[PDB]
Amino acid sequence: AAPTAYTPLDVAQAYQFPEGLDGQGQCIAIIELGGGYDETSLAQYFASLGVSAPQVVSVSVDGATNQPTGDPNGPDGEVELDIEVAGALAPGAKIAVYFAPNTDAGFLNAITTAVHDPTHKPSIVSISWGGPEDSWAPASIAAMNRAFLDAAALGVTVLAAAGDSGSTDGEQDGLYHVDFPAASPYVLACGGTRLVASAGRIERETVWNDGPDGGSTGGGVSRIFPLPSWQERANVPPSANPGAGSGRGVPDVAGNADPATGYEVVIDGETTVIGGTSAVAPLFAALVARINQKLGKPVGYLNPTLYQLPPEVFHDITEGNNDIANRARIYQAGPGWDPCTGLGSPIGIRLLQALLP
Numbered sequence: 001a002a003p004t005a006y007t008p009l010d011v012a013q014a015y016q017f018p019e020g021l022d023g024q025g026q027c028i029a030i031i032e033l034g035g036g037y038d039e040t041s042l043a044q045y046f047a048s049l050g051v052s053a054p055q056v057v058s059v060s061v062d063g064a065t066n067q068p069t070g071d072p073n074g075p076d077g078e079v080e081l082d083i084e085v086a087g088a089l090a091p092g093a094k095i096a097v098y099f100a101p102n103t104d105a106g107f108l109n110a111i112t113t114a115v116h117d118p119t120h121k122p123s124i125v126s127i128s129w130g131g132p133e134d135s136w137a138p139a140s141i142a143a144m145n146r147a148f149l150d151a152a153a154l155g156v157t158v159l160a161a162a163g164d165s166g167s168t169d170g171e172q173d174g175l176y177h178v179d180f181p182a183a184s185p186y187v188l189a190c191g192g193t194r195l196v197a198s199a200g201r202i203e204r205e206t207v208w209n210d211g212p213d214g215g216s217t218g219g220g221v222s223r224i225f226p227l228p229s230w231q232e233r234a235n236v237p238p239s240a241n242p243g244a245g246s247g248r249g250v251p252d253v254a255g256n257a258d259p260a261t262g263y264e265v266v267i268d269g270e271t272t273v274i275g276g277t278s279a280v281a282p283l284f285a286a287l288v289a290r291i292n293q294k295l296g297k298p299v300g301y302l303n304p305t306l307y308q309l310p311p312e313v314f315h316d317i318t319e320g321n322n323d324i325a326n327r328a329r330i331y332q333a334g335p336g337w338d339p340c341t342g343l344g345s346p347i348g349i350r351l352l353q354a355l356l357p
């Protein structure tokens, strides 16, 4: 396969992000449950891409703080990857990073604190943290979902990585599981692809699946939320879990996540390649930032609208499956919406165009 890597700009070009728009006037919130970011590596990275470095600021929730541990392989990787990908692509936007303790309550408070923030007023929030929906406490899931509902009502977009361990989401109970908060019908669930592209076009884009050891995109059918009414025409299948219950299909969209075709970033002074679905949420959040800029108002809750747009708005991923546990190939990609890549990778200009009144 020969391992390769792209810079965030390269991917954005492949997905045809709208030119002449950089997030000017927008604020992107990013939730972090641990680690931190150092300004030295951010300045270097933004300088290296020739974009004017966006203002980045940390917010403390329940006493949590921006505390990079210095380990390029730890949580800093998540924090700096999120910041670099979103800022590199929406340099005109202001980035607000919310640090909360790694608990259900901290996660929730971080979310509600950002959504209702009068000082930073974000219109978009990026989430690259989560867990299988079946393991969360019901009360947590209920409160989280409500907060996501409130975000929808207020016109704030919320994106979340669908997970990096295929259809089983890293559990060893023999069942399939989708990840939360991705599972929430109020968040735009971000899946992962293996993208082979040059600036002029996409030579190939398939489901991200490197097996148990390399990871694979989360995706499947929720066991908690029923199929949303606006997703009833997407042909979501019934869960593969004996019982075959119907439910909200994950994800909604997908973008390059395979680390073998990863993103070049600088983590704690270290230049490297990182991937996974957590790179996808910031990727599209900057996409959203550009649309919001062009349009007069925040696009907010996008799901219902996305599922009703014409085929031209998306590059259909039809090859691959996200099964890393067995040979059943559960949740395979196919024509149209699928439990691996949902509607596929968006085409920036066409998405913008479709939403330009």
Ligand SMILES: [Ca+2]
Binding pocket: 316, 317, 318, 333, 334, 335, 336, 337, 338, 341, 342, 343, 344
């Ligand atoms: Ca498809």
